[PDB]
């Protein structure tokens, strides 16, 4: 037989689910984010794509039902810069903080269990000591 | 600021991106495809997938409309098992055939624009040489 692999594929792929997200095209799901006093945010993603890097995304999507379009989810106690930071991990593979907003990012990154960013974020914080 | 990048996070995410596949989870395109004489198939997939990969599903399922939930498409001209093998690549990176099924794969691979495919058919039949 004859076999074929592009290793760069996941990357340019994600790329392009990337772009999707930032047209807003295709999305299914938009999540708001209402934390304490911060102003309400809304983050329009794919839910096939937040499944992927979350497990907690996957089982909140993942049930019987065949949902009807565009499904609204009310996400609470976690800030609108954390969720969108780590909506950007899930499409790009990377995440960017200022040193204090490191702790944050992890309570996030435990909330959605994204392995990935919890075992990063707490190297951080042990180096700086 | 602090920045951490996974390298291996798109391989990881497209995985669980083809077990929901193979589970039928998460779905909102099923590709009903008919050949000439072969039976018919279906596959179900995700559009956002699909799109990232193939610059003709993308634009065929980005249009205005918001669709409410599992769209059929009629796939005419291109045999279930090249399909098959298109759909595969575009959730895994890689791709397998026989060495007589490299030329339909080639024909499904340009009529969907998956560069990368092409361009490796194509040094595949000319190293037949």
Chains 1, 2 share one sequence.
Do not use: W
Not at 26 to 44: G, R, S
Not at 74 to 85: A, D, F, L, T, Y
């Amino acid at each position: 037989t004859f076999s074929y692999t592009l290793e760069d594929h996941t990357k340019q792929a994600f790329g392009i689910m990337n772009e999707l997200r930032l047209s807003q095209q295709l999305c299914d799901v938009t999540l708001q984010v209402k934390y304490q006093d911060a102003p309400a945010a809304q983050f329009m993603a794919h839910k096939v794509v937040l499944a992927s890097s979350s497990p907690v995304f996957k089982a909140m999507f993942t049930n019987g039902l065949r949902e009807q379009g565009m499904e609204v989810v009310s996400i609470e106690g976690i800030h609108p810069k954390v969720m969108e930071r780590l909506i950007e991990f899930a499409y790009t593979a990377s995440i960017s903080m200022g040193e204090k907003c490191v702790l944050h990012v992890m309570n996030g990154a435990v909330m959605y269990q994204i392995d990935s960013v919890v075992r990063a974020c707490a190297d951080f914080l042990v180096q700086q000591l």
